[PDB]
Symmetry: none
Subunit: 37 residues, 6 copies
């Protein structure tokens, strides 16, 4: 709940990422899904 | 709930990202979905 | 709820992003969706 | 030297092609080059 | 030297192709080169 | 020198191809080269 990230960093919570230089997604139904109740 | 990110950083909460230099998405049904109740 | 991001940063909450230099999206049904109840 | 191609065809000589439905080229120096002497 | 290709065909000579539905080229120096003397 | 290819075919001579549905090329120096003398 207190995130402190200095030069050139990366942090997350509950995150979903596809980090990276050359990214390619093809021929997909769904990429990100969430549900609650 | 208190995020402190100095020069050249990245932080998130509940985030969903596709970070990156050359990004390509093709032939997709859905890319981001959320539901609550 | 208190986000403090100095020079050249990125932060978010509940965010959904497609950050990146060369971005291309093609032949898609939906890109961003949300629902509540 | 005599090419006869009926409905819905493709033919070539000395050809260089990038045929196709969804085409994407990115971050390239050269795509087509020829030299003679 | 006499090519006869009926409906829905493909033929070539000396050809160089990248046929196909979803085509992606990225981060390349050269894609097609020829030299003679 | 006489190529006869009916519906839904493929033929070539001296050809160089990358046929196929989902094609991806990445981080390449050269893809096609020829030399003569």
């Amino acid at each position: 709940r207190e995130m402190h990230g200095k030069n050139w960093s990366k942090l997350c919570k509950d995150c979903q990422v596809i980090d990276g230089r050359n990214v390619t997604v093809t021929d997909v139904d769904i990429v990100f899904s969430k549900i609650k109740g």
